[PDB]
């Protein structure tokens, strides 16, 4: 042993991997060295030309919307060379290889302004970039050049059961420096014997006051015996006084499966949040509350009645949050083997497990041993999701999960890679399958390599609870993404590093002249000899943003004082002159939005397999650091407050047709403008219906905005999130679009109902996916949302257990609940977000 590049990797990932100030054992360094192996194993298995080019495509049929839009089996592409330009038609069939040598009679059709290849051995129809173009309406433009040189990617060389005692732990004392103001208060510490929020038994201390030390030198005795412990149970240790403070874990069985011996001083962490399953510790050692503890051997490794084959389906049929009662439970675990026959009934099966009882846990792992149903079933992506929840701490549960991912192809690990990351919190060891499956996908594929890294990163800067583990993530994929990514990535930090500090001077300064001139100022001194020539847009790697136009760039009127900033295209390939719009803001917690942005996105490909294409707009939104991140500017939108504010202003004066008139105006054939309304019919139902089942529906409409074709999105996700009437937001202006007022109806709105009942029940179609998505973002992502009765909102949302008639006419009712309303709730946000009342 490199040092300068332990360097680089602690600035890329924004955390030194090798500090162990913060450790009471080897699993981090451990988890180093395991993933070494896969690193290793797939970047020597990988094609270095596909590697280089990432052909970004798709195996799903080309939807139903998207083949109306080809004329015959026809698709023309414009190639480019040097000066030349040539349109040659094709069949959506062929493979570009083939296009290729339609043109002539050692080239790679690149998009044209960006790093984008359509190649490989699949159907031109079947690259993502084409299936965009198809959609927006946009026309297919490649240019033909010299592929990349794979030298570019260049990796740098290199007994348990037999002891029938009661387990236990002694609580010494708790040490805190300065307890709060509040005198006097009770103090005890209760400790859990947790696995997948299975509270195996419980153990308190007696009251004692509460001072800055607290010693009680007492053992606590559990009801459990040390050979009954399962691999990657929890001691859960809490403070409560008297509500709970403090809380920290420790694992009982480690990562060489070895029973945790001998004394501890934790530093806890301070007040279904996925934090409190930390076994990370708290790395303030000044301030903390600290808690000592002493332990004292290695771990090894007749027909159904009717009546009861329909109570067992009864139960395997219910919602991922339904509970199920002890009854439920001992029926599947005594119906275990048939059971095992439903993979829908997997999750529910492994929660009627004993996970107290070795005898049981080894009938379980029995029972996964005849698992030929579960590996001969079709990968269903919500199912395997709730075996990676908070639920199961079982790693060989949680490893068949994964095995089920495996099978996922490129595009749809993207889908889901958010929430995979997010998942690896609940995994009780650093190093899990999830992990090195997350590792593995993202050292095949640049582009998943390039969110895999954003996201780890996003969390390594503002997860003291997970940066340790996610940070030895980070490392083993840097170290095999080779050179090229190094450096793009090196780039872009440097960029958004730079970026970062001049927001921060910029708000410390309406926006008066001062803070104008200060902005642009500082824009110049960066731009001159300070900012690299070139990074690419982290919400949109294909795109290489160039030079800042300081004219464009302007400082928000927001109370945070976002960076509007314009940048223009480094590659000259580039058709239009268009700049490179991003929001650089600073003041929240980006990650929130993040995850409602991915859901949508997920609620567009549900949308997809039943052909329908509501028409949201999942706008690129990255967190890069500590309340601090980016958002994509949509080009030609405006605010539907600030449509209306052109009209009236001061006043709440909202106008019923303004927003019509404002389409109108915008359009400059009269036939556009009636797709303008089309696609304002679509995106509305589809906002509606997704921003219903997410609880997110009912906004002021400063927080909506509309592109100049009709294009309705909703946008600041964090503001209501944070500081969480009508059932979304469908106001006297948009009905008026659609041509109706009061007690009447239209074309339009007859669409309208049409359209929503659709989408809904095409949602409710993949209610289980929904669900355990929606539980897992806000146990993830939403801290203030994590109670029993936030995760619970989506069943009803979902109307859970309902006739698709019934379903159907619950959303109507929810659509003539905004008719009844009309302007009188964005009134009152008015009000509120305006003024102040
Ligand atoms: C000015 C501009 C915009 C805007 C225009 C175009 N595209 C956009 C994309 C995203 C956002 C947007 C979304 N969520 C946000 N949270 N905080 C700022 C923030 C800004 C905003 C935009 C929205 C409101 N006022």
Same mark, same amino acid.
């Given at each position: ?16 991997? =090798?500090?162990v100030?913060?450790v009471?054992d080897?699993?981090?360094?451990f988890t ?10 797939? @970047?020597?298995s990988?094609?270095?030309k ?8 798709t195996?799903?049929?080309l939807?139903e ?12 592409? @414009?190639i480019?060379?040097?000066?030349t330009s040539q =349109? ?7 493979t570009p290889?083939?296009?290729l040598?339609?043109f002539?009679?050692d ?7 960006r790093?984008?290849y359509?190649? +490989?051995?699949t159907?031109i129809?079947?690259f993502?970039?084409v299936?965009?173009?198809?959609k927006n309406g946009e026309?297919?433009?490649?240019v033909?050049? =010299?592929?990349? $040189?794979?030298?570019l990617?260049?990796?740098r060389?290199?007994?348990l059961?037999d002891?029938?005692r009661?387990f236990?732990v002694?609580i010494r004392?708790?040490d805190?420096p ?5 005198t006097?208060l ?5 400790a859990?014997? &947790?696995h997948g ?13 509460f ?8 053992? %606590? ?22 509500? /709970?403070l403090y809380?920290?874990n420790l ?9 945790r011996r001998?004394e501890?001083?934790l ?9 409190? /399953?930390?076994?990370?510790?708290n790395? $303030? ?7 000592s503890?002493l ?9 159904m ?9 009864a ?5 991922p949050?339904?509970?199920l009662?002890?009854?439920?439970k001992?029926? !599947? ?7 095992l026959?439903?993979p829908k009934?997997?999750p529910?099966?492994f ?11 080894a009938?379980?792992?029995?029972? /996964? ?7 001969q079933?079709?990968?269903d992506?919500?199912?395997?999701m709730?075996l !990676?929840?908070?639920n199961?701490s ?9 095995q ?5 192809e490129?595009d ?6 958010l929430?995979?990351?997010?998942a690896?919190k ?7 399958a999830?992990?090195?499956?997350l !590792?593995?996908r993202?050292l095949?594929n ?6 895999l890294?954003w ?7 503002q997860?003291?609870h997970?940066?340790?583990?996610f940070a030895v993530?980070l490392?083993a994929?840097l170290r095999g993404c080779?050179?090229?990514?190094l ?6 930090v ?5 970026? &970062?500090?001049?927001? %921060?001077?910029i ?6 002249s001062?803070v104008?001139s200060? /902005?642009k100022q ?8 300070? %900012?690299?020539?070139?990074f690419?847009?982290?919400?949109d ?5 160039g030079?800042?136009a300081?004219?464009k ?11 509007w900033?314009?940048?223009?295209c480094?590659?000259?390939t ?5 700049t ?8 929240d917690?980006?990650?929130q939005?993040?995850?409602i ?14 052909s329908?294409?509501?028409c949201? %707009?999942?706008? +690129?939104?990255?967190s890069?650091? $500590?309340?601090?991140g980016?958002?994509?500017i949509?080009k030609?939108?405006?605010t ?9 202003g001061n006043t +709440?004066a909202?106008?019923?047709?303004? !927003?019509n ?6 359009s ?8 303008? @309304?089309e696609?304002?019919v ?6 509606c219906?997704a921003?219903?089942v997410?609880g997110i529906?009912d906004?002021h409409?400063?927080?909506?905005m509309?592109?100049?074709t ?8 964090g503001?209501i999130?944070?500081?969480y009437?009508?059932?979304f @937001?469908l106001?006297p202006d948009?009905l008026?679009?659609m ?5 009447? =109806?239209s074309?339009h709105f ?7 009942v ?5 949602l ?9 998505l929606?539980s897992?973002?806000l146990?993830?992502?939403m ?6 009765e $936030?995760?619970?909102?989506i069943?009803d949302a ?9 379903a ?5 009712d ?7 309303? +009309?302007?009188?709730?964005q009134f ?10």
């Open positions: 042993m490199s040092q300068a590049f332990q360097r680089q990797l602690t600035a890329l990932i924004g955390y030194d991997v =090798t500090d100030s913060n009471h080897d699993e981090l360094e180093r060295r395991g993933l070494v192996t896969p690193r290793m194993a797939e @970047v020597a990988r094609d270095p596909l590697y280089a080019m990432h052909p970004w495509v195996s799903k049929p939807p919307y998207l083949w109306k839009k080809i004329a015959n089996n026809c698709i023309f592409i @414009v480019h060379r040097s000066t =349109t040659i038609k094709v069949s959506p069939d062929d290889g083939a296009i040598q339609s002539f009679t080239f790679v059709l690149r998009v044209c302004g790093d984008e359509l190649v +490989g051995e159907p129809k079947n993502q970039w299936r965009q173009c198809l026309e297919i433009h490649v033909l050049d =010299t592929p990349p $040189d794979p030298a990617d260049e990796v060389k290199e007994s059961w002891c029938d009661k236990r002694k004392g708790i805190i300065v307890l709060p103001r509040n006097d009770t103090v005890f510490v209760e859990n014997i &947790q929020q299975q509270v195996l038994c419980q153990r308190r201390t007696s009251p004692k006051p001072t800055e030390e607290v010693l009680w030198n007492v053992w %606590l005795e559990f009801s459990i015996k040390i050979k009954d412990l399962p691999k990657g149970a929890l001691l859960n240790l809490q403070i409560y006084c008297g509500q /709970l809380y920290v694992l009982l069985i480690d990562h060489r499966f070895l029973l001998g501890y001083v530093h806890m962490w301070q007040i279904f949040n996925a934090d409190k /399953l930390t076994s990370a510790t790395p $303030d050692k000044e301030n903390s509350m600290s808690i503890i332990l004292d051997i290695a771990l090894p490794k007749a027909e009645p009717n009546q009861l084959r329909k109570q067992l389906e139960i395997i049929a219910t919602d949050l339904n509970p009662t002890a009854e439920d001992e029926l !599947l675990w005594h119906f275990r083997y048939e059971s026959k439903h009934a997997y529910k099966l929660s009627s497990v004993k996970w107290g009882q070795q005898e049981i846990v009938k379980t792992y029995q029972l /996964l041993a005849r698992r030929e149903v579960w590996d079933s079709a990968l992506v919500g199912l395997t709730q !990676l929840d908070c199961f079982d790693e060989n549960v949680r490893a068949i999960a994964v089920k991912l495996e099978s996922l490129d749809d690990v993207l889908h889901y890679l929430q995979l990351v997010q690896v609940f995994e009780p060891y650093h190093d899990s999830l992990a090195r499956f !590792l593995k993202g095949r640049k582009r998943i390599g390039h969110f890294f996201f780890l990163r996003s969390e390594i800067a997860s003291r997970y940066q340790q583990r993530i490392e994929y080779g050179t090229a990514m450096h793009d990535f090196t780039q872009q440097q960029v958004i590093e730079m970026l &970062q500090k001049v927001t %921060l001077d708000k410390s300064l309406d926006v008066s001062q104008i200060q /902005l500082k824009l110049e001194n960066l731009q001159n000899l300070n %900012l690299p020539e070139s690419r847009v982290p919400y790697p294909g795109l290489k943003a030079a800042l300081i004219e760039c302007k400082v928000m009127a927001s109370k945070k004082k976002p960076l900033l314009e940048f223009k480094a590659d000259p580039a058709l239009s002159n268009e490179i719009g991003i929001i650089f803001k600073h003041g917690d980006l990650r939005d993040m995850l942005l991915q859901i949508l996105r997920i609620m567009e490909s549900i949308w997809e397999t039943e329908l294409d509501l949201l %707009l999942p706008y +690129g939104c990255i890069t650091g $500590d309340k601090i980016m958002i994509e949509v030609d939108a405006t539907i407050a600030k449509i209306q504010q052109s009209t009236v +709440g909202f106008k019923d047709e303004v !927003l008139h404002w389409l109108k105006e915008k400059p054939t009269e036939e556009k403008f009636q797709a303008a @309304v696609r304002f679509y995106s509305c139902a589809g906002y219906v921003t219903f997410l529906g906004r409409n400063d927080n909506i509309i592109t100049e009709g294009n309705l999105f909703h946008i600041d996700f503001h999130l944070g500081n009437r009508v059932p @937001v106001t948009f008026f679009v041509g109706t007022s009061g007690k009447k =109806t074309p007859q669409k309208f109902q049409d359209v929503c659709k989408a809904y029940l095409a409710r179609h993949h209610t289980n996916l929904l669900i355990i929606f897992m973002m146990m993830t992502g801290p203030q949302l994590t109670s029993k $936030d995760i619970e909102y069943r979902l109307t859970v257990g309902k006739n698709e008639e019934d159907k006419k619950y959303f109507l929810q659509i003539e609940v905004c008719r009844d309303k +009309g302007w009188t709730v009152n946000w008015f009000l509120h977000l305006v003024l102040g009342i």
